[PDB]
Amino acid sequence: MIQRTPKIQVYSRHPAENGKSNFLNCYVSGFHPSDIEVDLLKNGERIEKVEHSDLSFSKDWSFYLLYYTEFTPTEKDEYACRVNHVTLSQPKIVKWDRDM
Amino acid sequence: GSHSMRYFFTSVSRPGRGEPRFIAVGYVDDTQFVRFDSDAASQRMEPRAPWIEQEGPEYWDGETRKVKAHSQTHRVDLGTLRGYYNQSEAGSHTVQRMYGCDVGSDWRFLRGYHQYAYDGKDYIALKEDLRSWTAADMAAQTTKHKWEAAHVAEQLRAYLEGTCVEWLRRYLENGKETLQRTDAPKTHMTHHAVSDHEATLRCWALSFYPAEITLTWQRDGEDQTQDTELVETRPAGDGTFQKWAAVVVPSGQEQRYTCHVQHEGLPKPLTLRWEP
Amino acid sequence: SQTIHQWPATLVQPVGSPLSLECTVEGTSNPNLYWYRQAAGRGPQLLFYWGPFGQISSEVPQNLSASRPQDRQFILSSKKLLLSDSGFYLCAWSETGLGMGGWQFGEGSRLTVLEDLKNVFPPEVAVFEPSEAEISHTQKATLVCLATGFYPDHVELSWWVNGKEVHSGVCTDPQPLKEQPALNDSRYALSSRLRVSATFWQDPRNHFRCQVQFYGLSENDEWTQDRAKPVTQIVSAEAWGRAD
Amino acid sequence: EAAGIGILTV
Amino acid sequence: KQEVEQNSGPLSVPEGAIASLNCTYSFLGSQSFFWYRQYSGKSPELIMFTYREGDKEDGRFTAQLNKASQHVSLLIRDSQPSDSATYLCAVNDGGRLTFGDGTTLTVKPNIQNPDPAVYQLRDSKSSDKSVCLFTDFDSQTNVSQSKDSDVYITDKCVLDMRSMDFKSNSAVAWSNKSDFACANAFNNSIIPEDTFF
Numbered sequence: 001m002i003q004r005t006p007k008i009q010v011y012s013r014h015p016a017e018n019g020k021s022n023f024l025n026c027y028v029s030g031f032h033p034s035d036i037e038v039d040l041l042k043n044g045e046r047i048e049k050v051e052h053s054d055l056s057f058s059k060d061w062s063f064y065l066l067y068y069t070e071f072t073p074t075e076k077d078e079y080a081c082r083v084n085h086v087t088l089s090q091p092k093i094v095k096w097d098r099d100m
Numbered sequence: 101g102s103h104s105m106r107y108f109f110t111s112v113s114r115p116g117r118g119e120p121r122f123i124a125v126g127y128v129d130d131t132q133f134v135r136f137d138s139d140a141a142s143q144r145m146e147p148r149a150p151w152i153e154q155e156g157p158e159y160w161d162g163e164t165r166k167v168k169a170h171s172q173t174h175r176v177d178l179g180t181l182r183g184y185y186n187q188s189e190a191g192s193h194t195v196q197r198m199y200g201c202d203v204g205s206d207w208r209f210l211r212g213y214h215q216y217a218y219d220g221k222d223y224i225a226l227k228e229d230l231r232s233w234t235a236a237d238m239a240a241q242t243t244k245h246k247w248e249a250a251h252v253a254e255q256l257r258a259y260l261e262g263t264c265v266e267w268l269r270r271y272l273e274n275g276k277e278t279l280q281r282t283d284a285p286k287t288h289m290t291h292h293a294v295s296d297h298e299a300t301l302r303c304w305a306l307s308f309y310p311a312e313i314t315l316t317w318q319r320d321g322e323d324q325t326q327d328t329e330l331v332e333t334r335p336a337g338d339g340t341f342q343k344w345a346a347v348v349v350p351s352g353q354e355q356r357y358t359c360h361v362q363h364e365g366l367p368k369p370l371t372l373r374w375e376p
Numbered sequence: 377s378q379t380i381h382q383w384p385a386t387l388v389q390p391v392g393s394p395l396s397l398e399c400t401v402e403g404t405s406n407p408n409l410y411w412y413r414q415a416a417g418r419g420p421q422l423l424f425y426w427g428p429f430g431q432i433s434s435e436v437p438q439n440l441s442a443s444r445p446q447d448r449q450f451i452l453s454s455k456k457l458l459l460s461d462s463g464f465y466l467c468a469w470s471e472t473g474l475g476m477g478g479w480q481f482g483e484g485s486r487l488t489v490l491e492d493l494k495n496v497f498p499p500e501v502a503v504f505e506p507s508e509a510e511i512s513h514t515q516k517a518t519l520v521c522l523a524t525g526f527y528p529d530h531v532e533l534s535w536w537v538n539g540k541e542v543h544s545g546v547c548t549d550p551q552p553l554k555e556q557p558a559l560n561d562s563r564y565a566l567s568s569r570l571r572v573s574a575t576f577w578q579d580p581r582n583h584f585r586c587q588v589q590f591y592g593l594s595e596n597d598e599w600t601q602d603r604a605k606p607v608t609q610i611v612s613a614e615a616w617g618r619a620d
Numbered sequence: 621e622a623a624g625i626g627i628l629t630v
Numbered sequence: 631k632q633e634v635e636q637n638s639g640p641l642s643v644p645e646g647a648i649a650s651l652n653c654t655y656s657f658l659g660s661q662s663f664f665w666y667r668q669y670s671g672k673s674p675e676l677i678m679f680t681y682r683e684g685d686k687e688d689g690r691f692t693a694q695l696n697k698a699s700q701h702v703s704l705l706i707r708d709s710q711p712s713d714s715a716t717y718l719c720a721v722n723d724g725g726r727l728t729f730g731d732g733t734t735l736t737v738k739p740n741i742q743n744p745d746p747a748v749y750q751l752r753d754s755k756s757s758d759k760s761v762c763l764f765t766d767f768d769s770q771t772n773v774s775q776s777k778d779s780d781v782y783i784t785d786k787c788v789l790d791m792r793s794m795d796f797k798s799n800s801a802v803a804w805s806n807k808s809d810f811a812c813a814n815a816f817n818n819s820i821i822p823e824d825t826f827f
Contacts, residue, residue, distance in 0.1 A: 162724030255626030419729030
């Protein structure tokens with residue numbers, strides 16, 4: 001048995017512009033086993049209606065998934081990706097940075 | 101360039117829920133074109149790219165039969181492996197299989213592969229001669245003996261070198277507008293200081309396809325000389341990919357650094373420099 | 377060693393009766409199991425394909441269903457048969473997965489569904505003795521067994537000599553002939569020959585018996601005719617060897 | 621086109 | 631059946647010759663191919679399979695696959711009367727087999743010592759219809775049905791007496807009408823041997 005901790009990236013589909021429709025992405029990769037909990041948060045609250053890609057995996061057998069939801073960024077609203085996995089001692093929160 | 105067709109299969113046992121979760125996906129290069137999920141309502145292999153939709157009902161029915169057969173085979177495997185590793189019925193376990201073929205720029209066969217894993221570790225894999233097996237341990241040796249007696253490698257070779265490649269070529273032609281397209285990366289450099297001294301320059305690459313790219317930083321030139329923080333190439337969600345590479349440079353002397361972007365969609369490598 | 381076996385082998389039933397066919401396999405585990413139906417002059421057509429854990433495909437037969445109560449037990453059923461359900465039902469197996477092991481059929485289950493049971497008649501059987509002229513032109517003696525007046529056309533003819541079935545020197549018509557070619561419900565006839573040496577036919581101790589297994593009604597089938605019910609039965613005739 | 625041969629149980 | 635096409639036959643081959651059976655398929659994703667032999671009244675029996683281009687021999691049988699022309703064939707060397715049967719081609723179109731409708735093959739026995747004769751047989755007790763036996767003719771002789779509604783003639787049938795490698799063709803006719811005489815029973819046969827006491 002091998003368990004692997006997920007890598008997490010949170011970003012937008014297109015370059016952010018305040019008040020313009022876009023997509024918020026949370027890409028989790030390199031993990032095992034496949035069971036994983038991912039939520040996108042808006043100002044600390046779970047964004048309902050979030051979709052994700054079909055489970056797939058890399059050369060080293062580790063899994064990857066893209067979770068996403070349409071959204072419209074603003075100057076003040078804070079976005080984040082919350083992830084939990086058996087390899088993590090507690091859920092992990094990654095904040096969305098416009099330029100990352 | 102070269103191309104590939106790959107199928108990925110995952111089965112996860114679910115003690116106390118009855119049947120395992122099974123998910124299959126197929127790709128041509130970096131484009132997903134089919135999927136099957138045991139928990140979905142259709143119980144059909146489903147299209148995920150526009151060009152595969154033109155295949156007729158005979159094709160879909162056949163793919164659906166085969167993918168369901170893979171599923172049930174993995175389900176038997178989950179039981180056998182639990183026995184081989186002396187595990188209980190209480191734990192969730194995972195079986196994964198991947199196979200496919202690569203072709204070169206002339207679309208002729210380059211290589212084939214067929215690999216299998218249990219609980220996230222290599223179990224058995226076909227070597228590149230498409231005849232020999234690499235077995236991870238005593239359990240996988242038993243599987244190897246059974247598969248040698250049944251000429252599994254010979255069967256897989258006929259599929260990987262023949263069928264796989266013939267269908268990859270068909271798909272490449274039918275979906276030429278999609279699969280043979282090259283989207284050059286849109287690039288730009290970003291600026292972030294640290295109040296004093298050194299700064300960080302971040303070279304971006306967006307909306308590109310295929311996924312393979314090379315973002316390199318040179319100092320003065322010739323030798324790539326700068327420990328850059330580069331993130332994993334990542335999907336945009338629209339079929340294209342994104343990536344960046346950042347270096348820590350002393351305030352001023354920023355012109356000594358040039359970002360080298362290399363991608364199939366570029367006739368010549370690209371070079372960026374910080375401009376206020 | 378693997379074996380696949382199906383039962384019953386031949387069945388004659390009225391329209392509206394239930395059907396139950398069984399198939400069992402031995403020597404392999406978690407096999408793929410298949411039901412096929414084959415019409416005269418055509419190849420087997422798939423009805424159901426089951427993997428070890430359940431159905432994978434079916435050509436949604438109009439009036440049939442399948443079940444797999446155990447790993448190596450496969451059943452094909454119908455509550456009320458239609459005339460169109462007549463056919464040769466074949467069970468097959470393949471080894472777990474998608475590979476080359478197996479792909480073997482059982483013996484098959486021949487089903488004839490009938491609209492009117494009054495048409496059913498077993499065969500009358502008679503043995504005809506060798507022509508002395510034959511016995512002298514050659515040193516061989518040909519016995520002929522004739523089975524006539526039977527309907528439907530399902531019979532199995534065998535020869536027995538001194539209590540043991542024999543195969544040498546025998547040839548049986550592969551298909552029966554219609555006694556009235558212009559009638560949809562014509563009864564049938566079948567002939568067989570058993571050729572032996574003159575010496576063997578001339579020994580009075582030699583006993584020859586032509587035996588015809590006929591498949592007909594089951595004991596409980598509806599019947600209104602005066603005559604005894606034409607159930608599945610064996611009808612035979614005999615002759616003893618004879619010196620001039 | 622998925623494999624239709626060479627897929628056996630372990 | 632459009633998915634798998636085979637000529638129906640009947641195809642005749644002389645004993646000793648090579649029989650060639652052909653099959654074409656339309657399902658392009660077919661990855662394995664099979665030949666079955668089916669005797670009258672029996673289920674099909676697997677002869678062989680192949681999953682690769684070229685030829686595959688197993689004793690007297692050779693299967694051939696040409697994927698570019700979607701053609702599968704079966705060659706049978708040293709054909710024997712016991713090879714007479716319907717040969718079914720099948721393709722695996724994903725987890726199952728799809729069949730053609732078959733090619734019926736008849737292998738004509740080589741009769742080396744023909745002495746055609748028509749005899750009358752009769753176990754004369756409780757049976758109003760006597761029987762006539764046409765036997766020992768060569769395989770080029772074909773038997774036709776009677777042109778009389780009261781006269782019954784079976785098709786030729788080939789029997790084998792293990793001793794002297796003796797094989798013989800025969801056909802039987804009978805009738806319960808009065809004027810029926812064996813000397814008249816048959817039609818397009820070969821002249822020799824019509825005895826009468």
